[PDB]
Amino acid sequence: ENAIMLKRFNRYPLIIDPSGQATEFIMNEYKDRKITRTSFLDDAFRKNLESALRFGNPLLVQDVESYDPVLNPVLNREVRRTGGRVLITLGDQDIDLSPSFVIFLSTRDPTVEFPPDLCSRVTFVNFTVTRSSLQSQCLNEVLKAERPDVDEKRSDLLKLQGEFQLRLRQLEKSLLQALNEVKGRILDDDTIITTLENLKREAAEVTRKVEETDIVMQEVETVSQQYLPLSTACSSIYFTMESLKQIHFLYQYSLQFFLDIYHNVLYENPNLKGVTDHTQRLSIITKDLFQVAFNRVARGMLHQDHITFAMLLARIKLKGTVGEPTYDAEFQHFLRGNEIVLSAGSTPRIQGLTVEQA
């Protein structure tokens, strides 16, 4: 969706991405146009933008939080069209607008509060991974790996809207060009009927697909509801591992790391060599995900804190498991509910019981 936003736009976009993935993408997409990397803090940024504007070269500027107001006339897309020549005023310098000129604002920090003037002139495109984003990513991966048939049915449902219709239209056009090339000769009957029968078979397949869209949709819904707890657990695992940085400065982890544990557990899994039952494979993959995530986190983690991450994984599995009480009250009392003012009525009770224990 973000790439869709990048492709079709009127106001120039600003790229928000904690990683460099989007910057790499826009790099590869515009190599043919000779996209030049630039940053606002750079002193040569002015001459770079002027040169790119002269040849209509695409530009990307990093460090957008230190935005340069000098780009306001360019962002506004103001045009001083005079004498058959398109013109802009850049400070004291006057430049012509070479067409096919694009600028992509960029940054690396999710939490940047831009002024409203910068807000209005730009289309925000965001790449920050969230609960729902990683949740859906893990779901897509698990349907792609574990149940490729449902994944293919999902892809067919996706294509049936426009892609299958376009393919059918192009096949009809091929029939048209073949027929006008052959002028509908009775001698060409064999090829014509072969093509028309293949077209009829394709149309029948499409009609069966549109007649079964409810059944396929319900099956996809059932499988997604089956596989949802695993993806919720994965999102919780990743966000716990990310927030682990608060305990110790040594506990920094990336999304690439978590994707690595997910891929390792999904494909390179010894436990899933002989298992075939879908529910059995799902239980195995969940258990191995928890185990391998804990092992890989704690291998490079302090010994005094292993129990902390083990407890976090226990709570996450408890939230993900079914047929169990929610246990919010007991856990809340265990975490913080101990520090409630209750000094009143602190009787010694039994002699074996101390004051603090009381």
Partner 1 sequence: LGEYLERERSSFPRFYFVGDEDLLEIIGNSKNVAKLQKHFKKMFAGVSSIILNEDNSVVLGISSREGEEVMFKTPVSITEHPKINEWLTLVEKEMRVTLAKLLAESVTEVEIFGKATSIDPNTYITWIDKYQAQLVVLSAQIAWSENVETALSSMGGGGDAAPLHSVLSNVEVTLNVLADSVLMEQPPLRRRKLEHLITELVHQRDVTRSLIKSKIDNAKSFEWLSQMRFYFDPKQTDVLQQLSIQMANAKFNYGFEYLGVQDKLVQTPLTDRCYLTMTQALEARLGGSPFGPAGTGKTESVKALGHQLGRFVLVFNCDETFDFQAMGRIFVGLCQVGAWGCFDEFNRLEERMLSAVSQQVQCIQEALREHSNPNYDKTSAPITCELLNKQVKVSPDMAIFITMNNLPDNLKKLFRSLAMTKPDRQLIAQVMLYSQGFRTAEVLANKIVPFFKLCDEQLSSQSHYDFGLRALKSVLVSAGNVKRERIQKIKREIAENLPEQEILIQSVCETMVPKLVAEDIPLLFSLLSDVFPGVQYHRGEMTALREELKKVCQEMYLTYGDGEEVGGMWVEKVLQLYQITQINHGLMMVGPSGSGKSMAWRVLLKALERLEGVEGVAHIIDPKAISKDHLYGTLDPNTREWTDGLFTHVLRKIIDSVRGELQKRQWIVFDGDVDPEWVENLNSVLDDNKLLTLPNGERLSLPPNVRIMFEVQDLKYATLATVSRCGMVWFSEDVLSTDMIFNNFLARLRSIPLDSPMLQIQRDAATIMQPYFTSNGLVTKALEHAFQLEHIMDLTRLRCLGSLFSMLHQACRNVAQYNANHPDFPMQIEQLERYIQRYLVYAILWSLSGDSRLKMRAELGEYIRRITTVPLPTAPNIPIIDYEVSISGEWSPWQAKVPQIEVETHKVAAPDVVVPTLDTVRHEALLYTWLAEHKPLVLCGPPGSGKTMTLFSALRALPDMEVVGLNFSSATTPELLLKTFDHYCEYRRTPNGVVLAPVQLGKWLVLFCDEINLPDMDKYGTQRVISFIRQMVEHGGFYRTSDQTWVKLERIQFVGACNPPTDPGRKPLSHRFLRHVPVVYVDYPGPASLTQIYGTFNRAMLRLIPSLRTYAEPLTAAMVEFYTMSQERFTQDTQPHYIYSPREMTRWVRGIFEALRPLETLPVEGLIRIWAHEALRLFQDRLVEDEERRWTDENIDTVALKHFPNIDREKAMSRPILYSNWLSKDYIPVDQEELRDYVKARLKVFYEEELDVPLVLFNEVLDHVLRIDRIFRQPQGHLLLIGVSGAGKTTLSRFVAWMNGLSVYQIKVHRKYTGEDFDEDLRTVLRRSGCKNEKIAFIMDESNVLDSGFLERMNTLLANGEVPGLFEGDEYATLMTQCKEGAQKEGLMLDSHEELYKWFTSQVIRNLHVVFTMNPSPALFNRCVLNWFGDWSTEALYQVGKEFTSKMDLEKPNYIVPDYMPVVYDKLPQPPSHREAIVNSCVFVHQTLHQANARLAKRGGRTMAITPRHYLDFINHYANLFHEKRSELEEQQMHLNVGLRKIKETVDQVEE
Which spans of this chain sit near partner 1 (rule: CB under 8 A)? 8, 10-11, 68-70, 72, 78-79, 81, 89, 91-92, 111, 114-117, 119-121, 123-124, 169, 172-173, 175-176, 179-180, 182-186
Q: Which residue lies nearer to partner 1 by CB, 105 or 289?
A: 105
Angstrom distances, CA of residue 275 to CA of 96, 278, 280, 283, 337: 67, 8, 7, 11, 44
Instruction: Report the nearest approach of partner 1 to the CB of residue 183 (Å).
Output: 5
Cβ closest to partner 1, residue 2 vs residue 308: 2
* Residue recorded with tokens 């494909």: 267
Burial category of 103 from C-beta neighbours within 10 Å (exposed 0-12, middle 13-18, buried 19 and up):
buried
| Pair type for strands 59-62 and 93-96 | unpaired
d(CA 248, CA 223): 39
Which residue, 192 or 259, has its beta carbon nearer to partner 1?
A: 192
Quote the Cα angle for 115-117-122, to 5°.
Answer: 100
Minimum distance of partner 1 from residue 80's CB (angstroms): 9
Closest to partner 1 by CB, 75 vs 266, is 75
Give the position of tokens 């790449």: 127
The C-alpha R_g of the chain, in whole angstroms, comes to 30
Choose between 28 and 123: whose C-beta lies nearer to partner 1. Answer: 123
DSSP string computed for 185-237:
-STTHHHHHHHHHHHHHHHHHHHHHHHSHHHHHHHHHHHHHHHHHHHHHHHHH
**Residue 117 vs 205, nearer CB to partner 1:** 117
**Cα–Cα separations (whole angstroms), residue 281 to 43, 151, 225, 233, 314:** 57, 17, 16, 16, 21
* Least distance in angstroms from the C-beta of 167 to partner 1: 13
| CB closer to partner 1, 112 vs 311 | 112
CB of 44 to partner 1, least distance (A): 13
Smallest distance from the beta carbon of 300 to partner 1, in angstroms?
21
From the CB of 133, what's the least distance to partner 1, in Å?
15
What is the smallest separation between the CB atom of 127 and partner 1, expressed in angstroms?
A: 15
Among candidate residues 47, 46, 37, the one with its CA nearest the CA of residue 15? 37
Distance CA 20, CA 111 (A): 16
